[PDB]
Amino acid sequence: SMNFYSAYQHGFVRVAACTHHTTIGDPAANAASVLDMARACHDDGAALAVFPELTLSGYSIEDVLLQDSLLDAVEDALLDLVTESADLLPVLVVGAPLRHRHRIYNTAVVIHRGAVLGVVPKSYLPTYREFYERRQMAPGDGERGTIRIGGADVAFGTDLLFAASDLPGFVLHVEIAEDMFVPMPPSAEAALAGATVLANLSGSPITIGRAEDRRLLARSASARCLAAYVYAAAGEGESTTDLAWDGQTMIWENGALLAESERFPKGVRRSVADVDTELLRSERLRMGTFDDNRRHHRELTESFRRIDFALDPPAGDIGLLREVERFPFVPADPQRLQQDCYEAYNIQVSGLEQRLRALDYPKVVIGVSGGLDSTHALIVATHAMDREGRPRSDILAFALPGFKNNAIKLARALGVTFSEIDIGDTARLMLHTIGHPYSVGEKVYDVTFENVQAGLRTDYLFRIANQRGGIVLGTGDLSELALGWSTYGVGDQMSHYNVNAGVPKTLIQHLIRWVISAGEFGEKVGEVLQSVLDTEITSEAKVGPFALQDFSLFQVLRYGFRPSKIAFLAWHAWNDAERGNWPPGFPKSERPSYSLAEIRHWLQIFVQRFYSFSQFKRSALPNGPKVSHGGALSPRGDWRAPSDMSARIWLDQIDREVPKG
Amino acid sequence: SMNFYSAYQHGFVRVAACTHHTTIGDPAANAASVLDMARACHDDGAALAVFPELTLSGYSIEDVLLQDSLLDAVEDALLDLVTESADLLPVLVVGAPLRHRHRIYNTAVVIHRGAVLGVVPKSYLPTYREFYERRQMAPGDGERGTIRIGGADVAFGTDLLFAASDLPGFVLHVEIAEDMFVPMPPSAEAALAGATVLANLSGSPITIGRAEDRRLLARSASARCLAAYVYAAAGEGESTTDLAWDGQTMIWENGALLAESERFPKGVRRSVADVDTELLRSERLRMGTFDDNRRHHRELTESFRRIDFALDPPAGDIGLLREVERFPFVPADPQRLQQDCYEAYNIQVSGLEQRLRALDYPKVVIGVSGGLDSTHALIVATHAMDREGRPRSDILAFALPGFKNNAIKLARALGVTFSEIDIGDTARLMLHTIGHVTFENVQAGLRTDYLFRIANQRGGIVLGTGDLSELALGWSTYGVGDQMSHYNVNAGVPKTLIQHLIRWVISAGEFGEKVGEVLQSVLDTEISEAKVGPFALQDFSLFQVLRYGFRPSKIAFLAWHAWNDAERGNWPPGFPKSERPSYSLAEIRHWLQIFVQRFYSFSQFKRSALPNGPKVSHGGALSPRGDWRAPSDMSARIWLDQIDREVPKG
Amino acid sequence: SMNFYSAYQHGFVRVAACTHHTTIGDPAANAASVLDMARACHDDGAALAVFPELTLSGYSIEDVLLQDSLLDAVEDALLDLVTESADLLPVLVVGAPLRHRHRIYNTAVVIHRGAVLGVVPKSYLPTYREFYERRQMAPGDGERGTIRIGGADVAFGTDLLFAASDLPGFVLHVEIAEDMFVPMPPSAEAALAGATVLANLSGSPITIGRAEDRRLLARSASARCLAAYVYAAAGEGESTTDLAWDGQTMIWENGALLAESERFPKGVRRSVADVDTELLRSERLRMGTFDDNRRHHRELTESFRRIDFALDPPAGDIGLLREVERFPFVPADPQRLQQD
Numbered sequence A: 001s002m003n004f005y006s007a008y009q010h011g012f013v014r015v016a017a018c019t020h021h022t023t024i025g026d027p028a029a030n031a032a033s034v035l036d037m038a039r040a041c042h043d044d045g046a047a048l049a050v051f052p053e054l055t056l057s058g059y060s061i062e063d064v065l066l067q068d069s070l071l072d073a074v075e076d077a078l079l080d081l082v083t084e085s086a087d088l089l090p091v092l093v094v095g096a097p098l099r100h101r102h103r104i105y106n107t108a109v110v111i112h113r114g115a116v117l118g119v120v121p122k123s124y125l126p127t128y129r130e131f132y133e134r135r136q137m138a139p140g141d142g143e144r145g146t147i148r149i150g151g152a153d154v155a156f157g158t159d160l161l162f163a164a165s166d167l168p169g170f171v172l173h174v175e176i177a178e179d180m181f182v183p184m185p186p187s188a189e190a191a192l193a194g195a196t197v198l199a200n201l202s203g204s205p206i207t208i209g210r211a212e213d214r215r216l217l218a219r220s221a222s223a224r225c226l227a228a229y230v231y232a233a234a235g236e237g238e239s240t241t242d243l244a245w246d247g248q249t250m251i252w253e254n255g256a257l258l259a260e261s262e263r264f265p266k267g268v269r270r271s272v273a274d275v276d277t278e279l280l281r282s283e284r285l286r287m288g289t290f291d292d293n294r295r296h297h298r299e300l301t302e303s304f305r306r307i308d309f310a311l312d313p314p315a316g317d318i319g320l321l322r323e324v325e326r327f328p329f330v331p332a333d334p335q336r337l338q339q340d341c342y343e344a345y346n347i348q349v350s351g352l353e354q355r356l357r358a359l360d361y362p363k364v365v366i367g368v369s370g371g372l373d374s375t376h377a378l379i380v381a382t383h384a385m386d387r388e389g390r391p392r393s394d395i396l397a398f399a400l401p402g403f404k405n406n407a408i409k410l411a412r413a414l415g416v417t418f419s420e421i422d423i424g425d426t427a428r429l430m431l432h433t434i435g436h437p438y439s440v441g442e443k444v445y446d447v448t449f450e451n452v453q454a455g456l457r458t459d460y461l462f463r464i465a466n467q468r469g470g471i472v473l474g475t476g477d478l479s480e481l482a483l484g485w486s487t488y489g490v491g492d493q494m495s496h497y498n499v500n501a502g503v504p505k506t507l508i509q510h511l512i513r514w515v516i517s518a519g520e521f522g523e524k525v526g527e528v529l530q531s532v533l534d535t536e537i538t539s540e541a542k543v544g545p546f547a548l549q550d551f552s553l554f555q556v557l558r559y560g561f562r563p564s565k566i567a568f569l570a571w572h573a574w575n576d577a578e579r580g581n582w583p584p585g586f587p588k589s590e591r592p593s594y595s596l597a598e599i600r601h602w603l604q605i606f607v608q609r610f611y612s613f614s615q616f617k618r619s620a621l622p623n624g625p626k627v628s629h630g631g632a633l634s635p636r637g638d639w640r641a642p643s644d645m646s647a648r649i650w651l652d653q654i655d656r657e658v659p660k661g
Numbered sequence B: 001s002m003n004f005y006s007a008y009q010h011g012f013v014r015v016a017a018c019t020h021h022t023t024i025g026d027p028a029a030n031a032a033s034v035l036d037m038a039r040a041c042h043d044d045g046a047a048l049a050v051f052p053e054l055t056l057s058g059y060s061i062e063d064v065l066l067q068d069s070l071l072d073a074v075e076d077a078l079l080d081l082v083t084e085s086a087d088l089l090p091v092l093v094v095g096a097p098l099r100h101r102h103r104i105y106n107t108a109v110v111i112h113r114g115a116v117l118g119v120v121p122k123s124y125l126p127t128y129r130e131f132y133e134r135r136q137m138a139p140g141d142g143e144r145g146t147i148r149i150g151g152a153d154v155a156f157g158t159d160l161l162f163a164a165s166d167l168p169g170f171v172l173h174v175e176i177a178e179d180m181f182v183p184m185p186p187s188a189e190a191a192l193a194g195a196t197v198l199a200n201l202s203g204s205p206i207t208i209g210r211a212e213d214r215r216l217l218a219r220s221a222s223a224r225c226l227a228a229y230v231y232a233a234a235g236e237g238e239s240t241t242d243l244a245w246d247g248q249t250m251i252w253e254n255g256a257l258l259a260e261s262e263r264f265p266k267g268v269r270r271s272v273a274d275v276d277t278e279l280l281r282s283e284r285l286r287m288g289t290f291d292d293n294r295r296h297h298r299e300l301t302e303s304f305r306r307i308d309f310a311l312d313p314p315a316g317d318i319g320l321l322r323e324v325e326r327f328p329f330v331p332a333d334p335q336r337l338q339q340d341c342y343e344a345y346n347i348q349v350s351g352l353e354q355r356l357r358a359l360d361y362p363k364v365v366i367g368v369s370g371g372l373d374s375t376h377a378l379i380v381a382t383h384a385m386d387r388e389g390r391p392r393s394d395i396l397a398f399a400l401p402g403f404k405n406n407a408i409k410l411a412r413a414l415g416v417t418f419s420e421i422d423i424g425d426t427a428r429l430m431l432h433t434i435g436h437v438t439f440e441n442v443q444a445g446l447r448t449d450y451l452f453r454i455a456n457q458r459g460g461i462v463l464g465t466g467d468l469s470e471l472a473l474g475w476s477t478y479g480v481g482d483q484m485s486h487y488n489v490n491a492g493v494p495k496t497l498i499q500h501l502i503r504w505v506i507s508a509g510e511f512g513e514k515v516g517e518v519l520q521s522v523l524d525t526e527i528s529e530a531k532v533g534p535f536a537l538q539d540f541s542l543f544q545v546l547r548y549g550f551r552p553s554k555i556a557f558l559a560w561h562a563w564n565d566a567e568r569g570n571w572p573p574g575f576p577k578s579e580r581p582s583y584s585l586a587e588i589r590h591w592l593q594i595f596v597q598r599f600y601s602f603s604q605f606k607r608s609a610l611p612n613g614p615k616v617s618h619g620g621a622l623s624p625r626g627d628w629r630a631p632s633d634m635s636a637r638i639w640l641d642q643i644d645r646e647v648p649k650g
Numbered sequence C: 001s002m003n004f005y006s007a008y009q010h011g012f013v014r015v016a017a018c019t020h021h022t023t024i025g026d027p028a029a030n031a032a033s034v035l036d037m038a039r040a041c042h043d044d045g046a047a048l049a050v051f052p053e054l055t056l057s058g059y060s061i062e063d064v065l066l067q068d069s070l071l072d073a074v075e076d077a078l079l080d081l082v083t084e085s086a087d088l089l090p091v092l093v094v095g096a097p098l099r100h101r102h103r104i105y106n107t108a109v110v111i112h113r114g115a116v117l118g119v120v121p122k123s124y125l126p127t128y129r130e131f132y133e134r135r136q137m138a139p140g141d142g143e144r145g146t147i148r149i150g151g152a153d154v155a156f157g158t159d160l161l162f163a164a165s166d167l168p169g170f171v172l173h174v175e176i177a178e179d180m181f182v183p184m185p186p187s188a189e190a191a192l193a194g195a196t197v198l199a200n201l202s203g204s205p206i207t208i209g210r211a212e213d214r215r216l217l218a219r220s221a222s223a224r225c226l227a228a229y230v231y232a233a234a235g236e237g238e239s240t241t242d243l244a245w246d247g248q249t250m251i252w253e254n255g256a257l258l259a260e261s262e263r264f265p266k267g268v269r270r271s272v273a274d275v276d277t278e279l280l281r282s283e284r285l286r287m288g289t290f291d292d293n294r295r296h297h298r299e300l301t302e303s304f305r306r307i308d309f310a311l312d313p314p315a316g317d318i319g320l321l322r323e324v325e326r327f328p329f330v331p332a333d334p335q336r337l338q339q340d
């Protein structure tokens, strides 16, 4: 049914910030540069194209703004653009000095498919330092009503919203340069009122440090207002009588930079990006204090006039102009990954420090198997003990062989108290007592077989902890919590405190890597740790590759995206190993590509297990700290959900919407 | 420091609804009856005394209301009352027809220590059926400003609140009769504005079914408005030209009847009760939607004028005019207890029914020891399975001897699948392997270990059996132990109620005579508290904390008044007189120290990782996903210190 | 005439963001950690000392916030602080859950020289993801009037300004955590109204990426509002039942970071910096569109209640807690100089 490969059908909207070639005092020329750029935008299937402040006249022409011949030329040019726009897909937002009542206003003219939808005047006009705007032009704040343009009356003022009737995630608001720099910018009221994509036309003569100012204010705006912020500044061609221009364009989404263009270009430049309207939708649905703010400023926010237009965007495959990282929990950029690891580790450590202080420094009891999770937790434990001036011998590490050598090597190198307890006999006794086929020689490696052993490990650890005055450290990770890959209750799901509960599996390996690199525990410890990595990396058979499951988990836990949307995203991230970026630590022989067919398959498994099967294991969860901004799975925190629900609707959405391959 | 035995110092406020002797047309007489009744109220240490509609004139005198000599006499009487009040403790709320601007209003005059604090006019004046009030008197809704009374200007209107400066829990609002009968009564606005005690002066000629109307409206008002509602109607002495009068008085608190007086009495009557202002405070602190409602009507609610007075109540022991039941979770009244039991049981059962349906009808695995909790759970399980048309043999009951016979008897009688597994050897093996209290724990844990493994093996879920009182006190073996399970039908039922639920199941007689006999034996046989105190006291403290969050000294005061004397108050059914203990302050204090330490500090972590199961009691349950969100790593120092400082040692 | 070497006489005001040692559920303890830190601030000649969200109770105690004994203890502790403050120089801004009308509000109590100047309730209470604030506490937005505290009626609400009568460059406004995260934060109205130093008490359980969020919003706030922004988050001692805490403190001025403290410290930490009130004064005098914005929201901005206090700061040499670069046109940092 749905065209699976169409960005528009998954709730993206393609936006462009353009910097044209200014020809000061020559509107026909500026209009020509605009028309050519708008045609490119059309070709790219964009829905929106934002130009620089006072586009049609040039921002820097000062008193030439007041010349009748200039103002008349601007009108002529604007009407031709409007006429050409009948054949263009995107809504064009073009700057122009325009006559209304007594004066000329610094306006942005919102143009679409042959009509002017609205005209929006700058609200705050800088008249200080290099800025003289109040000399030529009038403030817009507080103007309402209509304005006459090519024999039509069209909405005029600071209170406008342009809403796409066939694309509700897309609601446009426009402001101009200085507007975003004052304590209470028009766009903040607009977002509370329903605007999701905020436009800014800017002239912005460039100086040292100013591009940082622009980024600080556009970025913070996108974040605080849970919105896209689309920004375009003037460039080559503006007068250099007292100023220079850099042509900067940028597109922001909720704090993140989607795109930006070359500063000081030779020639016109565009930023083109696919904004995820569902991402904005999801952020807002969850952050009730955003709506609370709206209600507080109800009078302000209900006064907006909503102007409708029908975008009717391209239905087909037009790619996805957006960076989709393979590991939502593991940034590919090394500066950022280093930071994330630093914070994850310190979260884990100090979380445990406080549990320890509160229990007047119990011993720490932990099962160590030489695998990734328990290795990392033993490290966390040791650091906590160190920072609290506790002897490392109060950490009681246990190997619990059933029916590798890294575990004792690590424990000996850290200098914790090591000990082995073979649970085989306890296991045989229990298997025979409940009458299981293995006790009678049959090779039935059941779920009860695997479970009796798993259970007996936790049983032992808990009893030792009662006996020796300790608490049992859990080692289960978030990806395990997500998928119900735990032995519930009497088993590895259960513990006194779980330092790993909020760390997804894809991040664990990078936390260990990080501890080695800090080099804090010395060379001997680093070598064992390194061996753990090398050994353990090279279950996954039943629940899928954790890379794919960690990807779906982030989408669901943070945004609640529907399955078809998660598949579209994962595919764009994973299907081609040569595209996008890998974090550090992925030798090229461990850089897999997944097909739609696979991504689909693992996702069916994921929704069934996450939404339905596994919640009961999460429901009775031991304490432990949240780590990732994506969320954690504590039924006391980020995820409150029924333990007895079917996942039918998610599975059915996959049947209907995701192609088989 | 605190006088522990003083109701006032524990945040009670003593209120009185009075019905005097009406002498129609004779204000001096009415004032005399009022002054005598006000003096009783004073002697009783009351803070408030509410009289009937139009007290000083008589409500029923019709056009006699418009006679100058009558209105003049009313004023003379009112002024003497005010003068006498200089020596009286309670705020007096006295009815009177009063001249203002063009007309007479139907007013209540709020009088205190020599001064008139305010004058409040009836808002809605019935003029239909037996009622002709708009013929003589003016509506007060919308009137503001002041009124001149004995040469002083005093607040006048529907927007008044009288707040005790030295007793913030006590904020009075007054309305009159009909006022509480309209879709949007003045008292509802007042409560949103801060009023905690709502007064109603009423004339209210009596007819068949009218007392029920008054109860329905006063009671629902007190509940919706999280308030005391204090009500007084006219009695003997009003004219019987076309009507009769019953003199009813009543005092309500958040839906509950605190007190009421004899209908159709010969002579004057009072209702006197201690309202718990902390209770109201607690209810409102918790129900945010109450404040939300206030904010939505902000204009309405901020317009109130708050008038201050200093009550300066008695500091000493004046007893407690309030019924404090011994078992907050177990009503002493048999009708009500039967109802609670019926509800609790059906909650447990249908909670488990849904788990089973969702898991496509797994077997139910349960450890049965022949004690109260597991017995009851097995019963619940059987019913659930019955209602879902599941064979009882899918219930796998297990005796798990360590290092009684009721258990197998019960299981055989119900016809579930019974089985014994001796865990002693598995225990010995484990104790030896770790090189061995932890003794009691190894066994407790191995039971749960086995149950879980059997459930994996035989396709079942393990039923928990831990009760709420065990959850409250941390009397569980955590994680690998009896705290852990796949679904816990008992988690929300406190121990004091368990025995009554069983008693109930016998009395319904639903499972037959043979089963009833075993169940009965479980009761007789089984009826820990060694280390954590009598569950009766701990269930008392639990309800106080979990519902109202009362401070320890306040919990001790309440528990003492309920428990210290076995002959006072009422016992629920099923307490033979040899099992009817009295506790001293010293004991109640002792167990409470244990309680706060264990509840606030030690035990939360066990509650934090709690299996699913249904909330049962209005008092609350202890799910960290529901009624109780709290830190697992907190000290209880401040509660223990509050006991040191405020509760006497004996 | 002027003491040339006195930071105060050249229009600086010394501010502190403090992270104390939380003892959940123990107000006397929290008060003790506060008093000790406030005394340090006094010794340092600070005019202002901002503590973490819900200081006196601990931010993370959830339903324990609703327990009578806890609320009573908070009151007792608050009054002792107020009494001790008679001998302290700086205005103290201390967090506390406080009873008013029907509920408890998440408040910051502005305390100075023996008196409470005002009580300020959080406006927006997060009830999503890890946040459950609306379960225990009431929203402050729109509350006005007074509140009774130790037998005095003091201003209550979101519309307060505390102005130093002898130091006009210093006009304080207080908000709380989430307040600065919404599209139209209380502090932006406050700055238009005349606030120059914006305080934020925060609990802010820490996660990956959150310190960046805090910096983005505090920094942009300081810049757009031409103001100092003084920020303090909870640290060691808050419950780690589901969350960790990092104790971050920071002081911002018009986009620039004046000071910040160690993240995840062992022990209490302070950020102490000299804010240049003349710098803020000058920025505002020149940027007329700031005042234009105020005029546009005239109704909003004139409704603020201005509460006066006399700081009477130290007249002598107390150094200058501020980085003053030798070459205003040539940044000393190489990354930044390369960019310039």
Ligand SMILES: Nc1ncnc2c1ncn2[C@@H]1O[C@H](COP(=O)(O)OP(=O)(O)OC[C@H]2O[C@@H]([n+]3cccc(C(=O)O)c3)[C@H](O)[C@@H]2O)[C@@H](O)[C@H]1O
Binding pocket: A447, A450, A451, A454, A480, A484, A485, A486, A487, A488, A489, A491, A492, A539, A613, A616, A643, A644, B359, B362, B452, B455, B456, B459, B460, B461, B462, B486, B487
């Ligand atoms: N909704 C619900 N509410 C309450 N109880 C529910 C339930 N659904 C199933 N149950 C019950 O819970 C039990 C099923 O859960 P459980 O027995 O824990 O486990 P289950 O999912 O049946 O099997 C556990 C599997 O997880 C894997 N595992 C185990 C241990 C460690 C790791 C690791 O690498 O970290 C992986 C291992 O392959 C094993 O086969 C059954 O007794 C079932 O009747």
Ligand SMILES: Nc1ncnc2c1ncn2[C@@H]1O[C@H](COP(=O)(O)OP(=O)(O)OC[C@H]2O[C@@H]([n+]3cccc(C(=O)O)c3)[C@H](O)[C@@H]2O)[C@@H](O)[C@H]1O
Binding pocket: A359, A362, A462, A465, A466, A469, A470, A471, A472, A496, A497, B440, B444, B470, B474, B475, B476, B477, B478, B479, B481, B482, B528, B602, B605, B632, B633
């Ligand atoms: N705040 C905290 N956060 C995380 N972990 C904490 C902790 N405090 C203790 N711990 C740890 O938890 C363990 C202590 O808890 P737990 O293992 O439950 O043991 P605990 O409560 O000390 O022992 C249970 C008591 O209850 C009795 N019991 C046992 C079995 C059934 C029943 C019954 O009638 O229902 C009664 C038994 O005789 C024993 O005296 C220790 O290992 C301790 O170090």
Ligand SMILES: Nc1ncnc2c1ncn2[C@@H]1O[C@H](COP(=O)(O)CP(=O)(O)OP(=O)(O)O)[C@@H](O)[C@H]1O
Binding pocket: A366, A367, A368, A369, A370, A371, A372, A373, A374, A375, A398, A399, A400, A401, A402, A457, A475, A476, A492
């Ligand atoms: N042989 C063994 N010795 C000690 N502890 C063991 C153990 N096998 C399992 N455990 C405990 O049970 C937990 C889960 O066991 P497994 O499912 O086998 C994961 P793993 O493959 O051991 O590596 P991991 O530590 O990266 O999870 C471990 O983290 C460990 O604490």
Ligand SMILES: Nc1ncnc2c1ncn2[C@@H]1O[C@H](COP(=O)(O)CP(=O)(O)OP(=O)(O)O)[C@@H](O)[C@H]1O
Binding pocket: B366, B367, B368, B369, B370, B371, B372, B373, B374, B375, B398, B399, B400, B401, B402, B447, B465, B466, B482
């Ligand atoms: N000997 C035994 N055989 C089978 N199950 C047992 C058992 N002892 C304890 N259990 C199970 O473990 C739970 C907790 O143990 P206890 O509280 O010590 C039992 P109790 O108080 O004797 O009976 P009760 O649980 O019915 O009140 C019981 O509810 C029961 O389900």
